[PDB]
């Protein structure tokens, strides 16, 4: 599916981290082994390099719910300039609209932010937008569409959102603007950029 549905399932086998703490949800001791029947012995017996490159690519793919073709387009866009591939790839990674919407604390999950963007309740440059895959730069308006402030989700998000220093906004004013660029260690360091970047010799 375009939306994987369960996120917990993928984090079981791949050991993927979406939010502050997902390896142990205290959900009756969820296994780090593969779901189903064979979470018994296939832990580290048959590892080869191409394999780790592959599930690292998969984990990188499932942090944002991004499909392969649009990531290939994004890598094309990255190759459309020079410099270190890691910094440009990461930068275009956060620059996706729903990611900033999530990082502001206006939505507790990237999926809710993407749904809000698609449904048209998100505004850019004083005009509503409906694409959750926008590339952004300094000076980009974001409102809350006050009709969509009574939502039980956005209220709790505004009360207890995640603070981000690369884009600054006042939580109780619900008006934001993209400010600056992030730093590498700020992003989750568990992702190895080398494997994901150089598995993509396709385009």
Partner RNA sequence: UCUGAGAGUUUGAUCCUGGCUCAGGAUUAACGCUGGCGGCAUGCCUAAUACAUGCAAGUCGAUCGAAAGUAGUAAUACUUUAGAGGCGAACGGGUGAGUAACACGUAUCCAAUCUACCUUAUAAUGGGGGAUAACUAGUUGAAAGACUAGCUAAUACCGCAUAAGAACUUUGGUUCGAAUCAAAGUUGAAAGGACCUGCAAGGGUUCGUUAUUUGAUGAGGGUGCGCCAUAUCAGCUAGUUGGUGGGGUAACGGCCUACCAAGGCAAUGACGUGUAGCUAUGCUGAGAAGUAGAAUAGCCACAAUGGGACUGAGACACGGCCCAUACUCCUACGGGAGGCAGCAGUAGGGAAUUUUUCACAAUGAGCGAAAGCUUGAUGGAGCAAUGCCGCGUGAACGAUGAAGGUCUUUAAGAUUGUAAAGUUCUUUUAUUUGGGAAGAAUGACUUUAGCAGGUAAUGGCUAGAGUUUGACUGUACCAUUUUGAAUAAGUGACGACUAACUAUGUGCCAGCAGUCGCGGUAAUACAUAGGUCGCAAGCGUUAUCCGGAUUUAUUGGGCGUAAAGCAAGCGCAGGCGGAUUGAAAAGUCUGGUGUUAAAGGCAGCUGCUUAACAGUUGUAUGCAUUGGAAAC
Partner RNA sequence: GGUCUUGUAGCUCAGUCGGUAGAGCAACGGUCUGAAGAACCGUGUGUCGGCAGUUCGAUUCUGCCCGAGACCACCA
Q: Which of 21, 44, 150, 189 touches RNA (CB under 7 A)? A: 150
Per-residue binder mask for RNA (CB under 7 A), 50-69, x = binder: xx-xxx--x--x-----xxx
Residue 3 or 181 having the CB closest to RNA = 3
Q: Please, which of residues 34-53 interact with RNA by CB under 7 A?
A: 34-39, 41-42, 46, 48, 50-51, 53
Using rule CB under 7 A, residue 20 touches RNA: no
Using rule CB under 7 A, residue 28 touches RNA: yes
Q: How many residues bind RNA (CB under 7 A)?
A: 76
Residue 163 DSSP one-character state: P
Beta bridge partners of 141: 177
Using rule CB under 7 A, residue 111 touches RNA: yes
Residues 6+ apart with CB under 8 A from 131: 97, 117, 118
Number of other residues whose CB lies within 10 A of the CB of residue 136: 17
Specify the DSSP element, H or E, that contains 13: helix 8-14
What's the length of the chain?
Answer: 203
């Amino acid at each position: 599916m375009k939306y994987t549905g369960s996120i917990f399932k993928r984090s079981r086998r791949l050991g993927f981290s979406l939010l502050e703490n997902n390896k142990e949800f205290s959900k009756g001791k969820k296994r780090k082994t593969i779901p189903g029947q064979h979470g018994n012995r296939f832990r580290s017996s048959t590892m080869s390099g191409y394999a780790q490159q592959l599930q690292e690519k998969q984990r990188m793919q499932y942090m944002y719910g991004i499909t392969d073709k649009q990531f290939r387009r994004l890598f094309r866009l990255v190759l459309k300039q020079r410099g270190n591939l890691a910094v440009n790839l990461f930068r275009v990674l956060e620059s996706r609209l729903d990611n900033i919407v999530y990082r502001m604390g206006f939505a507790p999950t990237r999926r809710s932010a993407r749904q809000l963007v698609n449904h048209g309740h998100v505004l850019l440059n004083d005009r509503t937008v409906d694409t959750p895959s926008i590339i952004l730069n300094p000076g980009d308006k974001v409102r809350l569409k006050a009709k969509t402030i009574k939502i039980p989700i956005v209220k709790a998000a505004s009360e207890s959102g995640v603070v981000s220093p690369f884009v600054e906004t006042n939580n109780k004013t619900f008006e934001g603007t993209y400010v600056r660029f992030p730093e590498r260690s700020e992003l989750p360091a568990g992702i190895n950029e080398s494997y994901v970047v150089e598995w993509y010799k396709r385009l």
